[PDB]
Swiss-Prot record, chain A:
It comes from Homo sapiens (Human). Changing residue 54 to A: Slightly impairs binding to RANBP2. One of its GO terms (biological process) is mitotic nuclear membrane reassembly. The modification N6-acetyllysine is found at residue 65. One of its GO terms (cellular component) is PML body. This is SUMO-conjugating enzyme UBC9. There is a cross-link at residue 49 (Glycyl lysine isopeptide (Lys-Gly) (interchain with G-Cter in SUMO1)). The record marks 100-101 as: Substrate binding. The gene is UBE2I. Forms a complex with SENP6 and UBE2I in response to UV irradiation. Forms a tight complex with RANGAP1 and RANBP2. Identified in a complex with SUMO2 and UBE2I, where one ZNF451 interacts with one UBE2I and two SUMO2 chains, one bound to the UBE2I active site and the other to another region of the same UBE2I molecule. Interacts with SETX. Interacts with HIPK1 and HIPK2. Interacts with PPM1J. Interacts with RASD2. Interacts with TCF3. Interacts with NR2C1; the interaction promotes its sumoylation. Interacts with SIAH1. Interacts with PARP. (Microbial infection) Interacts with human herpesvirus 6 IE2. Its main location: nucleus. Accepts the ubiquitin-like proteins SUMO1, SUMO2, SUMO3, SUMO4 and SUMO1P1/SUMO5 from the UBLE1A-UBLE1B E1 complex and catalyzes their covalent attachment to other proteins with the help of an E3 ligase such as RANBP2, CBX4 and ZNF451. Can catalyze the formation of poly-SUMO chains. Necessary for sumoylation of FOXL2 and KAT5. Essential for nuclear architecture and chromosome segregation. Sumoylates p53/TP53 at 'Lys-386'. Mediates sumoylation of ERCC6 which is essential for its transcription-coupled nucleotide excision repair activity. One of its GO terms (molecular function) is RING-like zinc finger domain binding.
Curated annotation (Swiss-Prot), chain B:
The gene is RANGAP1. GTPase activator for RAN. Converts cytoplasmic GTP-bound RAN to GDP-bound RAN, which is essential for RAN-mediated nuclear import and export. Mediates dissociation of cargo from nuclear export complexes containing XPO1, RAN and RANBP2 after nuclear export. It is found in: Cytoplasm; Nucleus, Nucleoplasm; Nucleus envelope; Chromosome, Centromere, Kinetochore. Homodimer. Interacts with RAN. Forms a complex with RANBP2/NUP358, NXF1 and NXT1. Forms a tight complex in association with RANBP2/NUP358 and UBE2I/UBC9, the ubiquitin-conjugating enzyme E2. Interacts with UBE2I; the interaction conjugates SUMO1 to RANGAP1, and subsequently stabilizes interactions of sumoylated RANGAP1 with RANBP2/NUP358. The complex composed of RANBP2, SUMO1, RANGAP1 and UBE2I associates with nuclear pore complexes. Identified in a complex composed of RAN, RANBP2, sumoylated RANGAP1, UBE2I and XPO1. Identified in a complex composed of RAN, RANGAP1 and RANBP1. Phosphorylation occurs before nuclear envelope breakdown and continues throughout mitosis. Phosphorylated by the M-phase kinase cyclin B/Cdk1, in vitro. Differential timimg of dephosphorylation occurs during phases of mitosis. The phosphorylated form remains associated with RANBP2/NUP358 and the SUMO E2-conjugating enzyme, UBE2I, on nuclear pore complex (NPC) diassembly and during mitosis. The modification N6-acetyllysine is found at residue 94. The lineage of its organism: Eukaryota, Metazoa, Chordata, Craniata, Vertebrata. Keywords: Acetylation, Centromere, Chromosome, Cytoplasm, Cytoskeleton, GTPase activation, Isopeptide bond, Kinetochore, Leucine-rich repeat, Nucleus, Phosphoprotein, Repeat, Ubl conjugation. It comes from Homo sapiens. This is Ran GTPase-activating protein 1. Coiled coil: none annotated. There is a cross-link at residues 22, 94, 156 (Glycyl lysine isopeptide (Lys-Gly) (interchain with G-Cter in SUMO2)). The chain holds residues 431 to 587 of 587 of the full protein. There is a cross-link at residue 94 (Glycyl lysine isopeptide (Lys-Gly) (interchain with G-Cter in SUMO1)).
Length: 157, 157
């Protein structure tokens, strides 16, 4: 009973294909039978130029629930990334990605991917999702940036 | 007399002492240290009965040492997972799963104060613990004495 989610996702796919930010990727995965699985998208977010993330292309999976758009999609970096707001599982945390917080129907896939891109170099230090990145960020900013640069080079296309 | 299961089910200073002079060994012996989540549970239940009184302080400290030595000395035990889940259960770090943070952090903080001074404690975990104990939090602000003590101790690690 995901007909409503599928209707919306079909339109978001057409909208994304028509126009999206350069360097970004967002494509529905395929089912075993070759048909599109609109509930599972493979995406990629480019590091923002001028930041320690530049040059890297960070892959992420967007998973939609049957009640979408009442609920936000679950976004997970694959593989998990070193970042204060990224769970060890890879799940990314953002106010617009929480039903109890800022998620709303007015939110698009483009807004979500741009929101995550912005979060990369502008982490929410008050609400960390992992102890590792938070600890380093707070104790040695230079070291933190060093680790970020290495990771960006590691995921350079 | 008492048993480990009843103690963990309904922790109390009296029940801990009722376990006998070998209570420290019993707690570790009866805990599945192959599971980080279970070690966190045992550590919190045991520390929840901490009292700044000779017999109880010794019993809690000895139990913590037996349990954590057994867990940490396991080459396969994931110490990072333990720390993360401990912080989650103490309500200092968010989690994707639903967990009911403990009410009183006094015992846990005092037990940690003792633990971090032991040889079995992986020093690599000190910076992470320090980052989350110094991070603003209502619960910690209520147990200022224990919090300040633990931090002062962490500075010497």
């Amino acid at each position: 009973m995901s007909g409503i989610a599928l209707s919306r996702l079909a339109q978001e796919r057409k909208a994304w294909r028509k126009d999206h930010p350069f360097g970004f990727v967002a494509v529905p995965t395929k089912n075993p039978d070759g048909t599109m699985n609109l509930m599972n998208w493979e995406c990629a977010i480019p590091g923002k130029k001028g930041t320690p993330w530049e040059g890297g292309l960070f892959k992420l999976r967007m998973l939609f629930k049957d009640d979408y758009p009442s609920s936000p999609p679950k976004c997970k970096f694959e593989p998990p990334l070193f970042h204060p707001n990224v769970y060890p599982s890879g799940t990314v945390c953002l106010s617009i990605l929480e039903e109890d917080k800022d998620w709303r129907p007015a939110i698009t896939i483009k807004q979500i991917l741009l929101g995550i891109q912005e979060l990369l170099n502008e982490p929410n230090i008050q609400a960390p999702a992992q102890a590792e990145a938070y600890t380093i960020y707070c104790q040695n900013r230079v070291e933190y940036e060093k680790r970020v640069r290495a990771q960006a080079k590691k995921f350079a296309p | 007399p008492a048993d480990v299961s009843t103690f963990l089910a309904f922790p109390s200073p009296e029940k801990l002492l009722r376990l006998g002079p070998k209570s420290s060994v019993l707690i570790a012996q009866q805990t599945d240290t192959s599971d980080p989540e279970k070690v966190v549970s045992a550590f919190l239940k045991v520390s929840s009965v901490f009292k700044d009184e000779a017999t109880v302080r010794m019993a809690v400290q000895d139990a913590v040492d037996a349990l954590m030595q057994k867990a940490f000395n396991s080459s396969s035990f994931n110490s990072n997972t333990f720390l993360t889940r401990l912080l989650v259960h103490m309500g200092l770090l968010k989690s994707e799963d639903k967990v009911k943070a403990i009410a009183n952090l006094y015992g846990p903080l005092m037990a940690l104060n003792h633990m971090v001074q032991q040889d079995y404690f992986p020093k690599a975990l000190a910076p992470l613990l320090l980052a989350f104990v110094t991070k603003p939090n209502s619960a910690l602000e209520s147990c200022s004495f224990a919090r300040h003590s633990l931090l002062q101790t962490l500075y010497k690690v």
